[PDB]
Amino acid sequence: ANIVGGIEYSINNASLCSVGFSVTRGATKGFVTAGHCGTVNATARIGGAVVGTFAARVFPGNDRAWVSLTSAQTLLPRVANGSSFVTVRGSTEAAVGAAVCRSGRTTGYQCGTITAKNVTANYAEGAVRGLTQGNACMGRGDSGGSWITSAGQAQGVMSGGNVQSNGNNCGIPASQRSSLFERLQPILSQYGLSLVTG
Amino acid sequence: AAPXXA
């Protein structure tokens, strides 16, 4: 499968999540995603085919993971935007107030701005600390997907927020949305990963 | 808040 940020993948033939970013660990190909998406060794599938398994994850506390893929996968330095793509160029962290977009299998590509950093989410499983908050909308299934600036600086992966009863926060004004992402810098250093760029 | 996932 071609690995692009934002596309759907399933975990153990049950849950759905979105790919965050193509990465390498030495000769190993992988993608970073949300920790809530799977446990170590869970099986990830793309379009019904097995593409790899969860190599490590932390959740709750943090919300991160990486999936090691088979050598047959094609890593690409891109994030889905509809039928178009955003090229990944690096991981400079943007500041509060910067515009950012996110890509995921449920709401597609949505943009907003970063409103706060170091936010704690009290999920039922336990708190997740240090997340960055944005007001781009998102929905069930977007977890793990890419957060990136239009200039291509990858920011982090979708963790959660204030989903409404229709399964997303797109039906409430940007001012009331809390869409939280795990910063990518700490995941690349924790697991020794290098982002694929173009 | 809830994580996400689907």
Give structural notes:
By secondary structure, chain A is mainly beta. Chain A has two domains: 3-76 and 184-196, Thrombin, subunit H (Beta Barrel); 77-183, Beta Barrel (Thrombin, subunit H). Helix content of chain A is 4%, strand content 53%. Chain A has an eight-stranded antiparallel β-sheet with strand order 3-2-6-7-8-5-4-17. The interface between A and B is medium-sized, with 31 and 6 residues. It is classed as hydrolase/hydrolase inhibitor. The entry lists the keywords serine proteinase, HYDROLASE-HYDROLASE INHIBITOR complex. Crystal structures of alpha-lytic protease complexes with irreversibly bound phosphonate esters. Chain A: alpha-lytic protease.
Brief account:
Chain A is mainly β and 198 residues long. In chain A, 4% of the residues lie in helices and 53% in strands.
Q: How large, in whole angstroms, is the Cα Rg of chain A?
A: 15 Å
Secondary structure category of chain A = mainly beta
Give the beta-strand count of chain A.
17
Find the CATH superfamily of the largest domain in chain A.
Trypsin-like serine proteases
Range of strand content of chain A: over 45%
Largest sheet strand order of chain A: 3-2-6-7-8-5-4-17
PDB class: hydrolase/hydrolase inhibitor
Keywords: serine proteinase, HYDROLASE-HYDROLASE INHIBITOR complex
Entry title: crystal structures of alpha-lytic protease complexes with irreversibly bound phosphonate esters
Chain A: alpha-lytic protease
